[PDB]
């Protein structure tokens, strides 16, 4: 084992000559890059350890385990502002990749920075990424109890994914809380938009039947059978 | 059946870390800013010294658990199979790969 | 001189094909003393192949065989492919089916030689690289303990650097090698830079004293 | 909403969306004849100055066949004539010129957003 | 409608998924007449890898191939004029000059050669590519050529002095296709790093990097009018507006899989030859796939042989010469006496499920 | 000549020596371009998640298919994905067209006596004996069918 | 008999119909010479 | 080992930063110094 | 860029007191002291009858990155050495 600093200085030269030799022959082999970048973290020289990950990103910046390991290397040494810059370059280079967005979130979740995940989610849901992002963004506000904020999301979420399983998710939100004045307002908005946008042909016959039935069976539980009954006539006439 | 795509597995591992973060807040309950520079465009965020240690220790501990789970999986992988003749560990490792293909 | 096959040589040949493959028969005969690469190929393709068909004769098989030997008279390599069977077995049963109408002392040393040759896979270049790497570390271990024993006497002698092979050879210990600094970030890593430098300088102070 | 801009500034939604989808008759004009000539005469003058650099620097004597002073310094405090030295035809011209090899750093000031679309992603074990 | 803007009150009123979708149904694509096979030419000993047309007077086309030889075919009768040997590996791209009687051809043997078509001999060879060269493009009105290949660089060659004048260094993979336009950006390139670059050849740097494709951008094609390029990855074809680098339109290429070639017509017909043999014709200004054909290989060949490798239109634009892997050259005629009625093509039906638009 | 000799003394030789193709290294450069074309077409048929490991294993089926072709052994991998088996057979036939046509071309040179290398006479003998048996084995199956 | 369905002309070409020295582009000779 | 397939080709990015040598090749000697233009 | 190159960074006190200075340009003169890579050697004399040739020792890129002159390698403003400059800041 290493005794003094001069034996350490000769130990570090032998490994760094070795690893830089295999990376000179193989620019590729991302696993070889990380094992030499992990070596420099063990030597407690983070200036070198940042450099190998930066050099490895110049070879293959689309390799996701390389991004996560360099982010985790900045987090394990408590360099939080080095990680914020790094995850910012992660999501600005590869905005499609879901892992890089969830990595930004659960670190700022871990720091209880609720205004930074909210600013992050507003940007991420502006690029129209998919239903996994929005559903984790409506689950974020339920944690924060922001009931007025999560109602603003479903206003935008039905405009990004116009389909009944996003509209019926919003009425499963409102009927979970029992607010009757808010639920039929969503129900009135959902059935008018099918009528307003009839010519676009984006809701199928089986798909509009889920909206009419879930409207009617809710009105049956609200003891107003005459509204349950009349909407069946307008829907059959509106769609014969 | 199928494998899990990298969008779902990112979501599921996101939810597991939220549940684990929720129980850390539950256990911390039971046991008891942004300033932008004028000179530069650089931005400064006030943080507690806790929850940065707690994130770093958690990332280290998860790395320990996954390392030892794979290490124990290494132990089982070289102690289970002994039927086919081999030459080294890498032979049995490659012929486990051919058994996985069947 | 034409030998018969012992069960020892039978097992060496099966393990040889398992490693070398079916087309390298001079590789197989190298393990197998007293036997020819032709003889090794002939046995595996007539006897030892587990794909071959050494079993009982259903009455479909006997009717098919007497059909084929009547339609293709005396063409046994053809018939054995139509029957998907070995050929002299197919003759042996056709000989029998018509008779229905009636009115270690040395070997283990070869096996010890075969057991070692199958389990040594490297060649000249890899075994030599192993030897040079073990001898290089042995020279390294020698020079370090030299320096420690001189340090026992108090007289300090530094480790010599490796000699440059070519002109622009890089001392990787000397400098940050190809310093690709990270892109300038907005979140202001200023307190973090101070704490790593203090922690890295603290780490270098620990190595001089306690020795890692 | 304390830092609304400073997350992923280089990527916008407008880069994803097509432009002919709003009107199929959007006019992308061809370059005008006065515009190709301003670009040709700039390109041809730049490349002819490059070919003359390669031919003059070659040691072949038969390459002049096929082919800036008084600059200001110190905020024009000193007018300085720039002249050339008459080279010895036997000494090697370009004394600092060797065949040496250089690795080059990459200048990365801005990140290029890799603008794919989202996600038809279901797949069995067929591949 | 106005209901969406008064209730779901937007900040842009275009960036909704509905307001984009209703404008696609509000517009109809131009009708184009369908295409049919007219002549099959069997002359090569290997695959046909590249086809170039005579840019002046339109008499002949030339097909470099996998049997290392370029053959010159008459366009009208289909007969064989001459054979140009002189590469030792497969000819990958062929370009004929309009201002010159010069024929430029690259191959996988690292060679870029010029050909005096008044003499049919190799003159003026070029040197410097580290690996095999894949494409040629002759600059209009500058006397350059642009070659690129597996070296991830674009060498801009002076014709007369044979000098690698400008090397454009930006890519990360082998370059599949290169184009030359008369104004900035004067070189358009596509490589296997899923990028399309727009080059400023005087500075030697990229004006705009187009990172929109997912996989290797195998083929681009310049529009003869309206100043745009269309690039084809392994399923998505995207038309690009040069001088801004703007994504003009996103085509309806679904399950096309590996497009081996593109060619754009004067009449806004975009061809997309795929490796699966399925060749499809699109409306250029809209993106509507209005015809999808499949080819027949030969009397006997493999099922992989049904693949279009290279394609061009002639100068009139009414003919489509495609070279395929079955050692054949197929000429595709857009049939006359078809109307908007009785030959509508495929129906214009955009969807929300595909996020293409 | 001496001007290149003296400038090589004062400056050293250039590091950018790009070797042209030659008769010496035509079979080697043919394979480097054939392996890149197969590695491209398979990596584009892949849906996702393919790395330098998975691209490395698939190119060995290309080599195994060419050895089965020369042996006239049917190359059938159980569990092979049918688009990828379609790609490899497309290029094995592509290499086979060059392999056979070079055997016809060099045979005509040996009869004329027109400067064939001593190695190539042994190589052309080795190519025709595979073509003769492959024509022989095919003639055996046409009688059998 | 022949594939592709009789609208398609299939032709197999194994010999050149031009001389190799025939110029593929005719040379521009403006002034008439009598030498 | 020691006999390997290429994972990638030698890029022209590396030769672009090198300093030139200016050695005189026989095939870069001046020849066909006049271009022919089409009518 | 070999045909587009910056003008040389030289001090005022290197040039001295005279108005017009005849400077000699050699396009690939010596190699840099710092980067060991060739550059355009400028050299000149203060007066016509001087006896000391003042050469540019470093290239313009090494002179820009340090913000020093090419001849005496002092800082362009403040005219101090680099080691004293980085100690005052
Ligand atoms: Zn310098
Ligand atoms: Zn000075």
Query: Using CA atoms, how far apart are residues C158 and C147, in angstroms rounded to an integer?
Result: 7
SS3 category, C65: helix
How many domains are contained in chain I?
A: 1
Note whether I59 and I74 are within 8 A (CB). no
Mutate to test the interface with E, among A133, A186, A193, A195 (most CBs of E within 10 A): A193
Of A133, A148, A239, A146, residue with least CA distance to A195: A239
Query: Per the structure block, which two tokens stand in for E108?
Result: 């996988």
Pairing of strands E60-65, E228-232: unpaired
DSSP C45: I
Shortest Cα distance, chain A CAs vs residue B80, angstroms: 28
E7/A contact by beta carbon, under 8 A: yes
Q: Between chains, do E17 and A196 touch, taking CB under 8 Å as contact?
A: no
What single string gives the DSSP state of each residue in B30-48? Answer: H---EEE-SSSS-EEE---
List the 76-105 stretch of F: residues with Cβ below 8 A of B. 79
**Spatial CB neighbours of E77, under 8 Å, sequence gap ≥ 6:** none
Of the bound ligands, which one is closest to the alpha carbon of residue I14? 2
Phi and psi angles of residue E3, each rounded to the nearest 5 degrees, phi first: -65, -35
Residue with tokens 């027109």: F114
- CA of I12 from ligand 2 middle (Å) equals 7
Of E321, E316, E326, residue with least CA distance to E275: E326
- CA of C177 from ligand 1 middle (Å) equals 18
Burial group, residue F94, by CB count within 10 angstroms (0-12, 13-18, 19+): buried
- CA of I69 from ligand 2 middle (Å) equals 5
SS3 category, A176: helix
SS3 category, E49: strand
Q: Sort out which chain E residues have CB atoms less than 8 A from G16's CB and list them.
A: 80-83
Resolution to one decimal, Å: 3.7
Nearest neighbour of E234 by CB, restricted to F44, F90, F101: F44
- CA of I75 from ligand 1 middle (Å) equals 16
Note whether E240 and E247 are within 8 A (CB). yes
Note whether E61 and E313 are within 8 A (CB). no
Phi and psi angles of residue F85, each rounded to the nearest 5 degrees, phi first: -65, -30
Query: Using CA atoms, how far apart are residues I42 and C161, in angstroms rounded to an integer?
Result: 39
Q: Sort out which chain H residues have CB atoms less than 8 A from A27's CB and list them.
A: 8
Q: What are the b/e assignments for D16-42, b being 16+ CB within 10 Å?
A: bbbbbbbebeeebeebeeeebeebbee
Query: I85: domain range?
Result: 4-89
H17/F contact by beta carbon, under 8 A: no
Q: Between chains, do F97 and E66 touch, taking CB under 8 Å as contact?
A: yes
Query: Using CA atoms, how far apart are residues A226 and A216, in angstroms rounded to an integer?
Result: 10
Q: Between chains, do A80 and B53 touch, taking CB under 8 Å as contact?
A: no
CA angle B70, B71, B77 (to 5 degrees): 85
Nearest neighbour of D2 by CB, restricted to B2, B7, B34: B34
- CA of I72 from ligand 2 middle (Å) equals 4
Burial group, residue E125, by CB count within 10 angstroms (0-12, 13-18, 19+): middle
Q: Between chains, do H18 and D98 touch, taking CB under 8 Å as contact?
A: no
Q: Chain H residue closest to C123 (CA)? A: H1
Q: Between chains, do I28 and D71 touch, taking CB under 8 Å as contact?
A: no
CB atoms within 10 A of CB E7: 12
Query: Using CA atoms, how far apart are residues A209 and H11, in angstroms rounded to an integer?
Result: 60
- Map out the domains of chain E with their CATH numbers: 16-357 (2.130.10.10)
Q: Between chains, do A120 and D7 touch, taking CB under 8 Å as contact?
A: yes
Note whether E286 and E249 are within 8 A (CB). yes
Calculate Rg over the CA atoms of chain D. Answer: 28
Q: What are the b/e assignments for E50-78, b being 16+ CB within 10 Å?
A: bbbbbbeeeebbbbbbbbbbbbbbebeeb
- For E261, what's the count of Cα atoms within 13 Å in the CB-facing half-sphere? 29
What single string gives the DSSP state of each residue in E266-322? Answer: TTSEEEEEETTS-EEEEETTT--EEEEE-----SS--STT--EEEEEE-SSSSEEEE
Burial group, residue F4, by CB count within 10 angstroms (0-12, 13-18, 19+): middle
Q: Both ends of chain G: CA-CA distance in Å? A: 58
Phi and psi angles of residue F49, each rounded to the nearest 5 degrees, phi first: 65, 55
Note whether E264 and E221 are within 8 A (CB). yes
DSSP H27: G
Note whether E33 and E336 are within 8 A (CB). yes
Give domain limits for chain B.
Answer: 1-102
Per the omega criterion (within 30 degrees of 0), is the bond before I17 cis? Answer: no
Shortest Cα distance, chain G CAs vs residue E80, angstroms: 5
Query: Using CA atoms, how far apart are residues A126 and C78, in angstroms rounded to an integer?
Result: 73
Question: Order of strands across the sheet with E237-241?
Answer: E219-222, E228-232, E237-241, E246-250
Burial group, residue G8, by CB count within 10 angstroms (0-12, 13-18, 19+): middle
Note whether D47 and E166 are within 8 A (CB). yes
Query: Per the structure block, which two tokens stand in for F128?
Result: 């025709």
E89/H contact by beta carbon, under 8 A: no
D99/F contact by beta carbon, under 8 A: yes
Burial group, residue G26, by CB count within 10 angstroms (0-12, 13-18, 19+): exposed
D120/F contact by beta carbon, under 8 A: no
C179/A contact by beta carbon, under 8 A: yes
Of B89, B86, B85, residue with least CA distance to B75: B89
Note whether E146 and E159 are within 8 A (CB). no
Residue with tokens 């006439």: A237
Of E255, E248, E214, residue with least CA distance to E228: E248
Shortest Cα distance, chain D CAs vs residue I19, angstroms: 6
Query: Using CA atoms, how far apart are residues A30 and A23, in angstroms rounded to an integer?
Result: 9
């Amino acid at each position: 084992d290493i005794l003094d600093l001069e034996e350490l200085r000769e130990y570090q030269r032998r490994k760094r000559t070795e690893y830089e030799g295999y990376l000179k022959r193989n620019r590729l082999d991302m696993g070889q890059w990380i094992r030499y970048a992990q070596f420099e973290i063990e030597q407690h020289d983070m200036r070198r350890a940042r450099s190998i990950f930066e050099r490895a990103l110049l070879v293959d910046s689309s390799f996701i385990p390389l991004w996560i390991r360099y982010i985790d290397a900045e987090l394990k040494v408590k360099c939080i502002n080095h990680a914020r810059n790094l995850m910012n370059r992660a999501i600005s280079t590869l905005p499609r990749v879901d892992k890089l967005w969830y990595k930004y979130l659960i670190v700022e979740e871990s720091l209880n920075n609720v205004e930074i995940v909210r600013s992050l989610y507003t940007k991420w849901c502006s690029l129209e990424p998919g239903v996994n992002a929005w559903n984790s963004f409506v689950d974020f506000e339920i944690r924060q109890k922001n009931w007025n904020g999560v109602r603003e999301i479903y206003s935008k979420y039905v405009m990004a994914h116009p389909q009944m399983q996003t509209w019926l998710k919003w009425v499963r939100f409102e009927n979970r809380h029992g607010n009757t004045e808010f639920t039929r307002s969503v129900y009135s908005l959902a059935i008018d938009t099918v009528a307003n946008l009839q010519n676009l042909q984006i809701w199928s016959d089986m798909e509009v039947a889920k909206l009419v039935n879930s409207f009617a069976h809710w009105e049956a539980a609200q003891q107003e059978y005459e509204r349950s009954s009349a909407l069946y006539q307008i829907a059959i006439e509106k769609w014969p | 059946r199928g494998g899990i795509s990298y969008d779902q597995l990112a979501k599921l591992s996101y939810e597991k870390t939220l549940r684990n973060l929720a129980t850390q807040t539950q256990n911390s309950s039971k046991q008891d800013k942004v300033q932008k520079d004028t000179k530069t465009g650089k931005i400064t965020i006030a943080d507690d010294d806790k929850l940065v240690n707690k994130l770093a220790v958690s990332l280290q501990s998860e790395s320990k658990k996954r390392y030892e789970a794979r290490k124990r999986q290494m132990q089982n992988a070289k102690t289970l199979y002994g039927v086919e003749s081999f030459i080294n560990d890498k032979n049995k490792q490659f012929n486990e790969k051919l058994s996985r293909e069947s | 001189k034409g030998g018969v096959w012992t069960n020892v040589e039978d097992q060496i040949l099966k393990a040889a094909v398992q490693k070398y493959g079916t087309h390298q028969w001079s590789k197989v005969a190298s393990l197998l003393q007293k036997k020819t690469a032709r003889q090794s190929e002939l046995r595996w393709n007539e006897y030892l192949n587990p794909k071959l068909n050494f079993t009982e004769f259903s009455k479909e098989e006997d009717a098919q065989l007497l059909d084929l030997a009547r339609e293709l008279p005396n063409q046994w390599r053809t018939i054995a492919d139509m029957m998907a069977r070995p050929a002299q077995v197919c003759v042996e049963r056709y000989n029998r089916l018509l008779e229905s109408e009636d009115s270690e002392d040395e070997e283990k040393e070869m096996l010890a030689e075969a057991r070692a040759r199958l389990l040594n896979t490297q060649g000249k270049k890899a075994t030599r690289k192993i030897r040079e790497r073990m001898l290089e570390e042995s020279k390294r271990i020698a020079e370090l303990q030299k320096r420690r024993e001189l340090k026992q006497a108090g007289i300090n002698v530094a480790i010599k650097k490796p000699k440059k092979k070519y002109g622009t050879d890089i001392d990787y210990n000397e400098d940050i090698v190809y310093e690709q600094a990270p892109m300038p970030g907005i979140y202001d890593t200023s307190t973090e830079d101070r704490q790593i430098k203090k922690k890295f300088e603290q780490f270098e102070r620990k190595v001089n004293r306690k020795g890692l | 909403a304390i830092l609304t801009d400073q997350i992923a500034k280089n990527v916008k939604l407008d880069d994803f969306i097509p432009k002919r989808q709003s009107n199929f008759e959007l006019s992308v004009p061809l370059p005008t004849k006065a515009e190709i000539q301003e670009c040709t005469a700039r390109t041809k003058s730049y490349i002819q100055r490059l070919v003359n650099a390669k031919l003059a620097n070659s040691n072949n004597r038969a390459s002049s066949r096929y082919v800036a002073p008084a600059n200001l310094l110190l905020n024009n405090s000193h007018h300085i004539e720039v002249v050339s030295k008459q080279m010895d035809p036997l000494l090697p011209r370009f004394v600092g010129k060797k065949a040496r090899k250089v690795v080059a750093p990459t200048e990365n000031d801005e990140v290029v957003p890799v603008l794919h679309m989202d996600g038809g992603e279901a797949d069995p074990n067929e591949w | 409608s106005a209901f969406v803007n008064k209730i779901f009150q937007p900040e842009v009123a275009e960036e909704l998924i509905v307001n984009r979708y209703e404008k696609l149904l509000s517009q109809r694509p131009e009708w184009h007449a369908p295409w049919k096979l007219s002549r099959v030419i069997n002359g090569h000993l290997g695959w046909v890898r590249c086809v170039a047309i005579d840019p002046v007077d339109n008499e002949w086309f030339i097909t470099g191939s996998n049997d290392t030889t370029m053959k010159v075919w008459d366009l009208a009768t289909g007969k064989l004029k001459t054979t140009l040997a002189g590469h030792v590996m497969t000819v990958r791209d062929v370009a004929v000059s309009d201002r010159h009687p010069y024929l430029f051809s690259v191959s996988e043997d690292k060679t870029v050669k010029c050909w005096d078509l008044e003499k049919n001999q190799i003159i003026r060879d070029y040197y410097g590519h580290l690996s095999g060269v894949r494409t040629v493009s002759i600059h209009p009105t500058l006397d350059l050529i642009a070659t690129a290949g597996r070296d991830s660089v674009i060498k801009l060659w002076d014709m007369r002095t044979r000098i690698p004048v400008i090397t454009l260094v930006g890519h990360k993979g082998p370059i599949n296709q290169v184009q030359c336009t008369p104004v900035d950006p004067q070189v358009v390139s596509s490589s296997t790093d899923a990028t399309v670059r727009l080059w400023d050849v005087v500075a030697g740097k990229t004006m705009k990097v187009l990172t929109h494709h997912k996989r290797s951008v195998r083929a681009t094609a310049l529009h003869p009018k309206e100043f745009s390029v269309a690039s084809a990855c392994t399923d998505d074809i995207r038309s690009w507006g040069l001088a801004e680098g703007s994504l003009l339109t996103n085509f309806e290429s679904e399950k096309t899989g590996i497009i081996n070639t593109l060619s754009i017509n004067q009449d806004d017909v975009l061809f997309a030859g795929g490796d699966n043999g399925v060749l499809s014709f699109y409306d250029y200004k809209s993106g509507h796939k209005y015809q999808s054909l499949a080819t027949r290989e030969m009397v006997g060949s493999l099922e992989g042989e049904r693949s279009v490798l290279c394609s061009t239109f002639d100068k009139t634009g009414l003919r489509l010469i495609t070279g395929e892997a079955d050692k054949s050259i197929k000429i595709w005629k857009q049939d006359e006496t078809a109307t908007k009625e009785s030959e509508p093509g495929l129906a214009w039906n955009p969807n929300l499920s595909a996020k293409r638009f | 000549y001496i001007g290149n000799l003296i400038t090589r003394q004062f400056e050293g030789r250039s590091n950018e020596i790009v070797k042209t193709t030659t008769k010496q290294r035509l079979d080697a450069y043919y394979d480097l371009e054939l392996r890149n074309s197969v590695m491209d077409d398979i990596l584009e048929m892949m849906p996702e998640s393919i790395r330098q490991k998975k691209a490395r294993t698939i190119l060995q089926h290309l080599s195994e298919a060419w050895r089965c072709w020369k042996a006239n052994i049917p190359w059938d991998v159980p569990g092979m994905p049918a688009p990828i088996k379609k790609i490899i057979e497309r290029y094995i036939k592509s290499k086979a067209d060059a392999w056979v046509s070079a055997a016809h071309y060099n045979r005509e040179r040996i009869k004329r006596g027109a400067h064939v290398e001593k190695t190539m006479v042994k190589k052309n003998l080795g190519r025709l004996t595979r073509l003769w048996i492959k024509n022989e084995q095919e003639r055996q199956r046409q009688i059998q069918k | 008999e022949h594939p592709y369905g009789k609208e398609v002309e299939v032709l197999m070409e194994t010999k050149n119909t031009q001389s190799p020295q025939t110029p593929l582009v005719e040379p521009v000779t403006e002034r008439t010479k009598l030498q | 080992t020691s006999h390997r397939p290429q994972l990638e080709a030698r890029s022209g990015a590396k030769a672009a930063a090198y300093t030139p040598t200016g050695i005189e090749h026989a095939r870069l000697l001046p020849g066909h110094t006049t271009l022919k233009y089409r009518k | 860029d070999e045909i587009n190159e910056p003008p040389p960074n030289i001090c005022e006190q290197c040039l001295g007191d005279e108005a017009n200075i005849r400077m000699t340009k050699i396009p690939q003169g010596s190699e840099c002291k710092i980067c060991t890579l060739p550059f355009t050697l400028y050299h000149f004399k203060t007066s016509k009858r001087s006896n000391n040739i003042i050469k540019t020792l470093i290239c313009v890129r090494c002179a820009t990155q340090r913000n020093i002159c090419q001849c005496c390698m002092l800082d362009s403003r403040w005219h101090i050495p680099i080691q004293l400059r980085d100690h005052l800041i």
